[model samples]
Target: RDDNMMFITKKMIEIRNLLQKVGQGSTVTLPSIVVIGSQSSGKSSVLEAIVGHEFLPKGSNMITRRPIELTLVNDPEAKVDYGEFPDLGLARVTDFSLIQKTLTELNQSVTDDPIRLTIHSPNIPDLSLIDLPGYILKRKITELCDKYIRGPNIILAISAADTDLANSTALQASRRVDPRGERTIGVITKMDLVEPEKGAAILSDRQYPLKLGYVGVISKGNLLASINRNEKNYFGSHPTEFGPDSGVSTGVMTLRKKLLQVLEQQMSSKLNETTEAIQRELEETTYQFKVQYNEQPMSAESYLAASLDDFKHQFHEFASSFGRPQLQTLLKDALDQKVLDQLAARYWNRPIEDLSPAPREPDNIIDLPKADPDSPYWHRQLDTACSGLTRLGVGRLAATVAASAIQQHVEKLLDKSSFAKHPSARKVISDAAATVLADRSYATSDGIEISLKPYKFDPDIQPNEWAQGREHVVGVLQAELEQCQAAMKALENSVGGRKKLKEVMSFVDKARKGEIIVEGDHPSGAGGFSAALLARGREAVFLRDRADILSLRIQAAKSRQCKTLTNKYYCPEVFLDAVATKLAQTAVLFLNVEMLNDFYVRFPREVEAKLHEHMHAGGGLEKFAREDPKVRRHLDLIRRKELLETVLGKIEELHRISSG
Candidate 1:
């Protein structure tokens, strides 16, 4: 009955072979004839009878210790049915003792892989049944049976007739999966070991009923030689449930015939739904990738990447903060204690928080040259430049009187107190000054002596490269000859002797850049020097009037005005106006731009350097959450996705091959 191929056993066998090859327990699940029974049930006796082989290990706690498969196919030319446990490498073992020995050896293993045994025989039917461990009475072992049977499997619920059927563990286990007992087929074994009245109720399907019904079999008692004949005799001679008039089938042959047709019908019926289930599990895998994997962009970019971001935020606020005390704190931490106080002494005479000077633009805008006793552009430049400097000038009747004013001014400038004392404070102040005149060139201990030197009026004298590169002249402004002659004579003999104008201008590198800012000469022309050279040769070379230059001029002009013996004429007062002029203009631009506003805009850049210095002295909070194990969870999920994805692929291929 099982050898006939009316339904789809060949494709199912193909699927059966593939699923076991994909592996037995845990991962791949498929519909099959799954046989489960309790401990000491005649489950092994029933499977051995069906397979017509003695390959299964029997006796005590060692009975059906693992899930196993028995596959039987018809081989017409064979003498008798023999067993082969292909997984154990035992093939063509006609000797039942050797097959039993191999089964016993493999059953001792701890692995959960189903022990597969195949039989090709002329004696047995074309059947395949998987037998789970008969110890399905325990919690852990019963779950193994439930794992296979919970799906759409044709459950062969083997019940020992000698045991109480009302309390039968195996059939009640099947009821959990099938619920209606529709997919469950009950088998009552060891029927001859009990009385008819005791077992008749169960055989009649009165107490525990299965939709596929129950078959009574004499699976074990007597010998393996007359195992089928003894089963027929046990049932045909029964007093009640097994009698011919009872109309219920008994023996292993009856169960075999029913199972062959039933396995075929179940697979044929459930083929489409099982394939859809495989597809359903496949579709379910992609959702974990979307829902679980993508939303954690925070892990890789979370702490370390963003640590540097807020780390930068931390230091920039430190540098440009209205928390102005912080800059002083960090600056002094980087260097000396008195360093910040020196900037105060150099640039600001006012309080540190109030470095602003009073607005002084309109004080001395009233002077311009018309030449002769005065000038035009030279005087305008002279007048406008005094705002960038402060003034001191006194016309002294005694030589010592002129000396005292310069003495007092230099005393005040060079020796500002409390704001100093430390040498680095002095060094820092000197470094803070942007541009100033050198002491060696014109400034001296008592007085500056640029007055002894005349700015050469003779055109052939070759103007200093300082004035040569930076010359500006528009119309006539002449310091006419007579007053300039007295100005020159008073300075020449007033000193130890006279210092050459070229020597004084060339003595320092700073002066070389600004020998004369605007040189004015009258040549009856608005444009060219050649045209101006042809006229009267009265030239007024405009000194570059800046704070340092105006200050130098004031000191030098005072020297001439103080010499009691050599004085012809000297106007010491004009340089005082020039110094005052340069001081105001410089203060306005210094406060509006270079000193104050740029510090605010520049904090971000300064913090960039300071952070590198401060943090790499240990990388700031970079070590804060460096080894956070969030990436471990993501890695584990990815590995699970790969496994499920691979499993789903094999199932799809199995579906395709089975359908074809």
Candidate 2:
């Protein structure tokens, strides 16, 4: 199923929200997958079945104990395809061959809980898949289920030959995550073990004499032996195509490749297609907003002359809505508290919710607390105050003022440093911010403007290679600049009446390629913005690429002195660059929010509202429901939308920010 299309817009909003949160100092990480099922029921095969590759090392222990990631290689075009588990350390086919060896050792290793692990494949570009321990029906299985097998998007495979179908524990376990049976798919294995005549009898009678089912029969031994001989010979000898040998048509092996191809092509293609579609919709929404808000001419004479009085009603309502104290407070509160708290938490790994400015009770529009210059938490004070205080309104203003003063005293900290030529190195330094967000799993950008200091590498020293390649470096940088200029020219050529959304992507692509930089002088641009850009330039000059930058930051963070180095230098870069990065990211999130509205427009208000509730509803909330049907339902729906908005909003922010 092409679920990506179904969720693309929503996903965009989610990515955007995450990015915004990142800007505010929150971070997000990709979800992990853990696969579980009975041994030999194609448990390992399921991963291969989806990924369309034999990733699990050959043999048959079902060897995986801890989780391993089948992640995508870092590249613009790469994405997760799908994933599989091979074996649990049963035998040694080779160094990586022990994948099978691990599967069989599940029983002997420990009965404490099902060993858990995550498998990430770029099968669907954005989707994360998990494979867990295959089960053996036993008393302890319940304990295993309680500990590990209790989350959404998890599946349990049952082999019909090795175990009973109607058992309580396994069935109950599967039902736990998906009581309606929507998220789970059951496979009954080992149908090939039954004789043709007996298989027919079992199907006709609707009763299995001993062993006949849908999962697979000859799959276990046949697959293991076939893989051992290599895939060609293994599948070549299989008799049936997709079903049992005797009574039905040909079994699954005959068209295994084709089946997998069909599935992968369907899902993978859908992901790309949907992503492209989402990009288009975002462009359209952006255009619409611009046309309505930016391009429209406003004149006092026309306004007094009653031009478009009818439309003014909606405009007035919207203006009124925007002016409401609650709305203003929402903006201010989000900027100060949510953004600052998130930023502090991700970088410091400390809860800053208590440190937030006290909330004022909302009564009327004008009654809301203003951004008091005198307040201790005033926005300007954010400039030099460390320990999270700098994130506050007053502190940030002070920081901005201080940053200007610092730049006046600034000469290049080092003449031939990595960031010498490009002043926008801060953008690249911002790439490290994604890691910070990933580690903390938080994002909450509101209405905050940040000021940053120009980056000066700690104990600044040019690496030996960098010194040697100085001439080559200039050549490379020059060539890159030319390429960017050439791309801008290409963009000009492509411009018709209005540049297409694809054209905009081309521009973003150019920016991403280190061609065009963001740190040039602009009338409205702040010195802080220029400083941030300088940091990005330094990052671009020295770092390989976006993913490379992220990997390096994380690897560096793992060192013993990471905190000390970061606190003294990169922390501020991470903080301010994160905000800039998130601004770009949040635009995408807002687009996704609009897209979700587009998707929901198809359903009746009631049903749409209900589905939204299910999607965004909190973990458990019966007590919060009202006694009356309409009022209770209304409150419940509001809560659900709020929860979902926060969730999807964050995700969308992260995606764009990560890509940006």
Instruction: Judging by lDDT against the true structure, name the best candidate.
Output: 1
lDDT (CA) per prediction: 0.47, 0.35
Report the C-alpha lDDT of model 2 over 295-401, residue by residue, as the tens digit: 34433223322322422343344334432233223233333334334333333222111122233333211211233334333222233423243234432332232
- Per-residue lDDT for 537-620 in model 1, tens only? 121112212223334333433443323212111221332222222222232232223323443354335534443454456544
- Could you tally the backbone clashes for each prediction? 19, 120
RMSD of each: 28.4, 34.2
Query: 10, model 2: CA deviation in Å?
Result: 14
State how far residue 284 of model 1 sits from its true place (Å). 13
Sliding window of 10 residues with minimal summed lDDT for model 2: 450-459
